[PDB]
Amino acid sequence: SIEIPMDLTQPPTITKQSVKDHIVDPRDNILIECEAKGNPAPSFHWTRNSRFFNIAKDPRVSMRRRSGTLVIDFRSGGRPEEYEGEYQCFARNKFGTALSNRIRLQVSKSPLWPKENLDPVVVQEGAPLTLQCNPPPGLPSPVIFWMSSSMEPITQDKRVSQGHNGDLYFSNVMLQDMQTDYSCNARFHFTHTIQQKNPFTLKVLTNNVAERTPSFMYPQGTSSSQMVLRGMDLLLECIASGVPTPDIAWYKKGGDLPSNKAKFENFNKALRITNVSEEDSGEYFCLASNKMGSIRHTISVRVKAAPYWLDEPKNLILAPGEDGRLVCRANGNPKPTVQWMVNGEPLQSAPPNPNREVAGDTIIFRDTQISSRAVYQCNTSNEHGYLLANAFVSVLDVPPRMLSARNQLIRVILYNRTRLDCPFFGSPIPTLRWFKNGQGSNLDGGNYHVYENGSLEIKMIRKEDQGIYTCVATNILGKAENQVRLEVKDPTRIYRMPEDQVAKRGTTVQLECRVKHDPSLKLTVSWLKDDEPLYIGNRMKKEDDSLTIFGVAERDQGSYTCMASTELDQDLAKAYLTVLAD
Amino acid sequence: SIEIPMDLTQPPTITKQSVKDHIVDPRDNILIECEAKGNPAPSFHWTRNSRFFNIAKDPRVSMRRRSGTLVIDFRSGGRPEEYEGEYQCFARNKFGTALSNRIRLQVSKSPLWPKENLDPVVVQEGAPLTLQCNPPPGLPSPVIFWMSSSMEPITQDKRVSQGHNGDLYFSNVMLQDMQTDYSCNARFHFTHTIQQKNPFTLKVLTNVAERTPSFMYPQGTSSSQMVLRGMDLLLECIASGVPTPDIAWYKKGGDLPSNKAKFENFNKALRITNVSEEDSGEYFCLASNKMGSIRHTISVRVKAAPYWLDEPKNLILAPGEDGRLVCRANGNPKPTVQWMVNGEPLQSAPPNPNREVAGDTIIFRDTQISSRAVYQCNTSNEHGYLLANAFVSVLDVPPRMLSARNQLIRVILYNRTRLDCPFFGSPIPTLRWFKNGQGSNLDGGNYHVYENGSLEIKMIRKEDQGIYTCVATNILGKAENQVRLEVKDPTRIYRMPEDQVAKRGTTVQLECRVKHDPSLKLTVSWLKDDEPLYIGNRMKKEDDSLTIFGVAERDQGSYTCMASTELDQDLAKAYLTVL
Ligand SMILES: *[C@@H]1O[C@H](CO)[C@@H](O[C@@H]2O[C@H](CO)[C@@H](O[C@@H]3O[C@H](CO[C@H]4O[C@H](CO)[C@@H](O)[C@H](O[C@H]5O[C@H](CO)[C@@H](O)[C@H](O)[C@@H]5O)[C@@H]4O)[C@@H](O)[C@H](O[C@H]4O[C@H](CO)[C@@H](O)[C@H](O)[C@@H]4O[C@H]4O[C@H](CO)[C@@H](O)[C@H](O)[C@@H]4O)[C@@H]3O)[C@H](O)[C@H]2NC(C)=O)[C@H](O)[C@H]1NC(C)=O
Ligand SMILES: *[C@@H]1O[C@H](CO)[C@@H](O[C@@H]2O[C@H](CO)[C@@H](O[C@@H]3O[C@H](CO[C@H]4O[C@H](CO)[C@@H](O)[C@H](O[C@H]5O[C@H](CO)[C@@H](O)[C@H](O)[C@@H]5O)[C@@H]4O)[C@@H](O)[C@H](O[C@H]4O[C@H](CO)[C@@H](O)[C@H](O)[C@@H]4O[C@H]4O[C@H](CO)[C@@H](O)[C@H](O)[C@@H]4O)[C@@H]3O)[C@H](O)[C@H]2NC(C)=O)[C@H](O)[C@H]1NC(C)=O
Ligand SMILES: *[C@@H]1O[C@H](CO)[C@@H](O[C@@H]2O[C@H](CO)[C@@H](O[C@@H]3O[C@H](CO[C@H]4O[C@H](CO)[C@@H](O)[C@H](O)[C@@H]4O)[C@@H](O)[C@H](O[C@H]4O[C@H](CO)[C@@H](O)[C@H](O)[C@@H]4O)[C@@H]3O)[C@H](O)[C@H]2NC(C)=O)[C@H](O)[C@H]1NC(C)=O
Ligand SMILES: *[C@@H]1O[C@H](CO)[C@@H](O[C@@H]2O[C@H](CO)[C@@H](O[C@@H]3O[C@H](CO)[C@@H](O)[C@H](O[C@H]4O[C@H](CO)[C@@H](O)[C@H](O)[C@@H]4O)[C@@H]3O)[C@H](O)[C@H]2NC(C)=O)[C@H](O)[C@H]1NC(C)=O
Ligand SMILES: *[C@@H]1O[C@H](CO)[C@@H](O[C@@H]2O[C@H](CO)[C@@H](O[C@@H]3O[C@H](CO)[C@@H](O)[C@H](O)[C@@H]3O)[C@H](O)[C@H]2NC(C)=O)[C@H](O)[C@H]1NC(C)=O
Ligand SMILES: *[C@@H]1O[C@H](CO)[C@@H](O[C@@H]2O[C@H](CO)[C@@H](O[C@@H]3O[C@H](CO)[C@@H](O)[C@H](O)[C@@H]3O)[C@H](O)[C@H]2NC(C)=O)[C@H](O)[C@H]1NC(C)=O
C-alpha cells in the first residue's frame, strides 16, 4: 500500500484495533482498542450488537483522547460478564468513514459443575467401560484431567485413557481399577481455576476372562467424517475395546502422513496434524490390531478454508481526472462472496457516483474528481469466516515530495548486495529513476533493481559502483531529487588460513590467520574451539597473525575456527587438529 | 415437650425451618423453609432485615401453600447474592404467633486470587522463611494446600510445613527447596472449586553456622486464645533453627487428656477435639534444639454458647390450674433471658393478672381460657443465643387414646419388646399398665415405663404372653387400650452341619435341622462362603439338609445355613474340604 503524509487532506485509516475473538479475564478492566489517523481530526463512535452504543449514558465506559479506544473500569462496581457481545468501531471525518472488524468480546468464565448425583458403577471384569466427563464450557475449552477425589494421581495407559472430549475409556476393566475413584477435573485457562465433577466409584464382578475381538468405543459405525479449517489443528481419535488391549495404527489412503506436521498422542490413539492444508484432505483409517483380530475404521477428512488475501485492496492515490481501480480478491473454500460498502453504507444504496462502475469484485473509477473521495470497505465472507478491508480514494494536487533525509551515506563491502532507500510521494504517483555520477542513463536492468517504493537494490557490487546516486521522482506537477553516497570498502579476506594437522602429545602447534581488510575499518579476530568461543589461557599464545598451543593433548583435539570481522564484513576459517595417542 | 392432637384448638408450632447460618449455592433457586402447625390453619409472614418482607411486590419470591416456606426463582433473571440478609418467619393464628430463628441467608463464595505479580523470593541458606498465602475470604472456609504450578505435590516434614492460617513455614531453608515452585491452593467443598495462587519462586544464597531456636508463628513469649465449648482447640508453635528443632507440648499443673488431645503437623500443632470448661488453663510449648530450648505459653479460656439445662415445654392445663414455664440455659458468660408474648416484648405486652414473671421462670396461677398464647424465650450471650417457643393451652377434653385399639404384637422368646401407648389429656393424665387383669401396676424389674407412655419389657419369658392393658386417667375421666403379646418359640438349629473332608465324585451332605414355632413361616437358605445361594445345578436343597454332587475345587470353603422367620434368625457354619 501507499500512505499519505498527514499534512495533506486524508480520509481516516485504522492503525490498531482489538482482535476478532477478544477473550478477557473476569478480573481485569476491559479495553477495546480502536485508533485511527486522519488529516482532519477523526471522531469515533461504536455499535454494540448492530445498534448504536452510547458512551455518555454509561459512566463506566470512557473513550481515550484522539482515538476510539474504550476503557471500562469496574472499581466503582459491575461485572464484565454484562458487556459480552459484538462491538464495531467507526472512524469518521469530513472525507469519509472507516470501519473496524467486529470484535466478539467474551469473558473467560469458570462455571461450576452442574449438580448431579452419580450412582455406583458396576461392571463385569474384562468388559469395556466409558466414564463420560461432560465438562462445563469455557473459553478456551478447559483442560480435562482425571484424579481421585482425594487428588491422588490416576495413571493412564494404552488400556485406560481419556479422549479429547475428556471421557475416560477402559478397553477392558480389571480388578486393580478399583484402587481409586475417578473424578473429572477441568482447569480453566485465564483463572487457573479447577472445577471437580463428583467422583465415580467402580464395582467389578469376576467371571462366573475369555478373549474377545477388538471393537471401537468412541467412533461409532464403520466410517465417519470430520471438517477442519485451513491452518487449524486436525485431531483424529480411535479407541478400541478388547480383552487383549488393542494397538491402534494409523494410515492414509494414497499417501503417508507428513512427517513434519503429523504427531501421535494418547498412546497412538490420537493423530494430530498441525498446519493443515488442502493437501491434507483425504481418507484416514485406523486399525485396532490385536492378538485375536483386527478391524478398521475410516474417517473422511475434508479441509475447508476461511478467506485469505490474494490481492488486498490498496488505497487509491489519484489526481483529478485519472483512472484507477480497487481490487478485492480473497481465496477460500467455499469461495468467498464479496460485498462492497462505501463509508459503512452498502454500495447498492450509496450516493450514486457516475465515475464509479462496480463489477463482481472490482470497482473502476474513470475520470475521478474531488467527489467520491471516500473510504470503501470490502467484506469477503464464507460460512467459515470473513475478511474486512478498508481502502480510501484520495484525489489531491500536490507536487512530488521526498520523504527521506538528504545526501545520506551508505558503506558496503565489495561483493555484498545493497539497497538504497528513497521513499517519495506525489499527487499523481510520480515515476522514480536512479542515476549515477550525473549520467543520463537511468539505472535499471542487469545488476540493478527498482522497487515500487523507490528503493534500488544492487545485487553484486563492483568497485566501480562507488559514488553518488541521485533518485528523481517526477509527475506532471513537477519533480524532486535526493542524493545518497555509496562507498565500497575492501573486503576482509583471510589470505593465510589455519591448516589441518595431526600432532603427537607434547608438541607445539601453530594455526596462522592473516587477514587483509580496508584500512579505514576496525578489524577484530577471535577463535572458536569446536564451535564455541575459545578462552585464551596458559600455554596458549594469541599472536596478531597466529595462535600457538604448547603441549597439546587430547583436550585440544577438534576444530578451530578463526573469525575475522568488521562492522560490515565477516570471514571464517576452519581447521582440524588431531592429537595422537601413545 | 408434649404434643397436642390437631383436632383440638392449639396455637401454632414451628415444625421445620432453615438453619441460622444458611449458605446457598449461587446457581440453585433459594429456599427459606418455615413450616408450622395449628388447629386454625396458621398464616405466615416474613421480616427481612428486621422489616416487613412484601412477597407480592417481588415476582421471584413466592410462598408455598399452607406454609411460610419462601421459594425464590431465578429463571426469569436475578442472582441469589441480591437476596442475602436476615429473615425471620412469623406463624400466626387466632391463638398466637410463633417465631423462628433469624436465618442469615448468605451465598457461598469461592473467590479468585487478586491479580498479583509476585517477586522471586530470595533467602540465605539456613534462614527462617514464611510464605504467606493470604486467601480472599470465602464461605465456607476453604482447605488450604500447597502445590507446584505443574500440580506436583510438595513434601512437608518437621522442617517445612503449613500452619492452620495456610502460610508455609521453613524453620531453616535448604538448597533443595529451589527444586519446585510453591503455589497456594484453596479448595471449596461446597461448590467443588479449586483456586490457585500465583506460584512463588525460591532463590537461595550460599555463604552453615548453628543457631538457637526462635519462634515464628506465635510471636512473643505468651499469647492468648479463646475457644467455644464443643469446638476444636488448635494450638500451633513454629520454631526456626539451624538444627531443625522439635516442638513438645505440655500443660501447667495437669496432663493432656489422652482421649481428646492429638498431635498434628509433626508435633507442631495440638488439637483438643471436644473441648470443655476443664480443658481451659495454660498450655506451653518447648522448641527443644541442640543449641537451646525456649518456651511459649498460651492461656486457653473456654467460653460457651448457651445450651439448654431445662428447655421450656408446652404448658397443657385445665381452667383454674397452675403451671410454670422454665427457661434455663447454661453458658459462659451466663445467658441473659428475654421473654416475648406472641413475638412482642413482655415489657410492652398486654398485662395479665394470672401471669407473674421472675428471672427466667413464668408462673401462671388460676389460668383461664384467656391468655392462651405462644411465649418465646431468647437466652443470649455474646457468643450465641437460643430461641424457644412454648404455648399455654387451656382445654377440657377427657383422656384420649392415640393408638389403635386391640393391637397385636408378636415376638420370639428372648427378644426385648416395647409396647407403645400414646395418650393425651387436658390435664396431664397418669398412665398405668396391667396384665391379664392382675391389678398390680407393671413397673420395677423386667419392666420400664417412659415419659411418653411406652412400656419396655427387657427379657421376655413364656409367662409374659397375654393381654396388656394401658390406662390413662385424669379428673375428667379415663381411657384404656389393649395389646395382645404373643410369644413364639425360638428357631433353633438342633442338628448343625459339621466340618467334613470328602473326595471327588462323592455325594456330600450337610444337615441343618431347624425347630421353629408351628405358627410361623420358616425360610431356610444356604450361603457359600459369604454370598447367597444359587439353586439348581447338581445341588439339591432338602427341607432339613443340603446335598452336593460332583464336588470340585469350587466347593471347598465355608458353608452357612441360615434359618430365618419374620421374627427370628439363626446361623450355622461348617467347613468343607475336597480332595
Ligand atoms: C462480513 O460479512 C459476514 C457475512 O455476511 C458477516 O458475518 C456475519 O455476522 C453476523 C453478525 O455477527 C452473524 O449473525 C450472527 O450469527 C450468530 C450465530 O452464528 C453462529 O452460527 C452461524 C450459523 O447460523 C455461523 O455462521 C457462525 O459461525 C461464524 O462465526 C464464528 C465465530 O462467531 C466462526 O468461528 C465461524 O467460522 C463462522 O465464521 C456461528 O457459529 C447469532 O448468534 C447472532 O445473533 C446474535 O446477535 C444478533 C446481533 O448481531 C442479535 O440480533 C441476536 O438476537 C443474537 O444476540 C443475542 O445473543 C447475545 C449473546 O449471545 C445477546 O447479547 C443479545 O442481546 C441477544 O440476546 C447473529 O445472528 C452471521 O452469522 C455472520 N455470517 C455468517 C455467514 O455466519 C460479518 O459480520 C461482516 N463483517 C463486517 C465487518 O461487516
Ligand atoms: C436474641 O437476642 C440476641 C441478643 O439480643 C440477638 O442477637 C443479636 O441479634 C442482632 C440482630 O441480628 C444483632 O445485631 C446486628 O449486629 C451486627 C453487628 O454484629 C456483629 O459484630 C459484633 C461486634 O461488633 C459481633 O459480636 C457479632 O458477632 C456475634 O454474633 C454473631 C451472630 O450474629 C456470631 O456469629 C458471633 O460469633 C458473635 O456471637 C456480629 O458479627 C450489625 O451489623 C447489624 O446491623 C445490620 O443489620 C441491621 C438490620 O438487621 C441494619 O439495621 C443495620 O444497618 C446493619 O445493616 C448492614 O449490615 C448488614 C450485615 O450486618 C447488611 O446485611 C445490611 O445490608 C447493611 O449493610 C445488627 O445490628 C446483634 O449483634 C446480636 N447480638 C448478639 C450478642 O448476638 C438475637 O438475634 C435474638 N434472637 C431472636 C430470635 O430474636
Ligand atoms: C552484507 O552486509 C551486511 C550488513 O552490513 C552484513 O551483515 C552484518 O555482519 C556483521 C558481521 O558479521 C554484523 O555485525 C555483528 O552483528 C552481531 C549481531 O548483532 C545484532 O543482533 C544482536 C542480537 O543478536 C543485537 O543486539 C544487535 O543490536 C545487532 O542488531 C553482533 O553480535 C556482532 O558484535 C560484535 O561482533 C564482532 C566480534 O564477534 C566484532 O568485530 C563487532 O565489532 C561486534 O563487537 C557484530 O556487531 C552485522 O550485524 C550484520 N548486519 C546485518 C544487517 O545482518 C553481511 O555480513 C554482509 N555480507 C557479506 C559481506 O557477504
Ligand atoms: C428381635 O427383633 C429384631 C427387630 O425386629 C429383629 O431384627 C430384625 O429381624 C428381621 C427378621 O429377621 C429383619 O428383617 C430382615 O431384613 C433383611 C434386610 O435387612 C431382609 O433381607 C430379610 O428378608 C429375608 O429374611 C426373611 C425372614 O423371614 C425372609 O422371609 C425373606 O424372604 C428374606 O429371605 C428380613 O426382612 C430385620 O432386618 C432385623 N432388623 C434389622 C435392623 O436388621 C431380630 O432378628 C429379633 N431377634 C433377635 C434374636 O434379635
Ligand atoms: C522498500 O521496499 C523494500 C522491499 O520490500 C524494503 O526492503 C526490505 O526491508 C525490510 C525492513 O528493513 C527487510 O526486512 C528485514 O529482514 C531481515 C532478514 O534478512 C531481518 O533480520 C530484519 O529484522 C528485517 O525484518 C527486508 O529484508 C528488505 N527486503 C529487501 C529485498 O531488501 C525497504 O525497506 C523499503 N523501503 C522503505 C523506505 O520502505
Ligand atoms: C416413646 O419413647 C421411647 C423412648 O425413646 C421411644 O422408644 C424409642 O423409639 C425410637 C424410634 O423407633 C427407637 O430408635 C430406633 O432404634 C432402632 C434400633 O437401633 C433404629 O434402627 C431406628 O432407626 C431408630 O433409631 C429407640 O430405639 C426406642 N428406644 C427404646 C428404648 O426402645 C418410643 O418410640 C416412643 N413412642 C412413641 C409412640 O413415640
Author numbering:
A (entry chain A): 24 to 231, 250 to 623
B (entry chain B): 24 to 230, 250 to 621
Task: Please give the exact wording used by the authors of the publication that reports this structure.
Cell-surface expressed contactin 1 and neurofascin 155 control wiring of the nervous system and interact across cells to form and maintain paranodal myelin-axon junctions. Defining subfamily features are extracellular six N-terminal immunoglobulin-like domains (Ig), four fibronectin type III domains (FnIII) and posttranslational modifications, i.e., N-glycosylation at multiple sites and a C-terminal glycophosphatidylinositol (GPI)-membrane anchor. All four members are type I transmembrane proteins with six extracellular N-terminal Ig like domains, three to five FnIII domains, various predicted N-glycosylation sites, a single transmembrane spanning helix, and a ∼120 cytoplasmic region with a highly conserved ankyrin binding sequence. To address these questions, we structurally characterized the contactin 1 and neurofascin 155 interacting regions, i.e., Ig1–Ig6, individually and in complex.
Domains Ig5 and Ig6 interact head to tail and together make a V-turn with respect to Ig3–Ig4, giving the molecule a distinctive garden hoe like architecture. At the Ig4–Ig5 tip of the V-turn, neurofascin 155 N-terminal residues 23–31 wedge between these domains and interact intimately with both. The Ig4–Ig5 mediated V-turn is stabilized by extensive hydrophobic interactions, in which a central Phe466 of Ig5 is surrounded by Ile25, Ile27, Pro28 and Leu31 of the N-terminus, Ile358 and Leu437 of Ig4, and Val439, Leu444 and Ile 470 of Ig5. Conservation of the residues involved in the N-terminal, Ig4 and Ig5 interaction suggests the V-turn architecture of Ig4 and Ig5 is a shared feature of L1 family members. The 18-residue splice insert present in between domains of the Ig2–Ig3 unit in neurofascin 155, but absent in neurofascin 186, is for a large part unresolved in neurofascin 155 due to flexibility of this extended loop. At the center of the neurofascin 155 homodimerization interface, established by Ig2 domains with more modest Ig1 contributions, a super β sheet is formed by joining the G β-strands of both Ig2 domains. The dimerization interface overlaps with the binding site for contactin 1, suggesting that competition may exist between neurofascin 155 dimerization and contactin 1 binding. The Ig2–Ig3 unit combination hinges at its connections to Ig1 and Ig4 by a 17° rotation that bends the plane of the Ig1–Ig4 horseshoe. Despite the stabilizing role of the N-terminus, the Ig5–Ig6 combination swings parallel to the Ig1–Ig4 horseshoe by a 19° hinge at the Ig4–Ig5 connection. Glycans at Asn residues 316, 457 and 494 are juxtaposed in the space between the Ig1–Ig4 horseshoe and the Ig5–Ig6 combination and may limit the flexion between Ig4–Ig5 depending on the glycan composition.
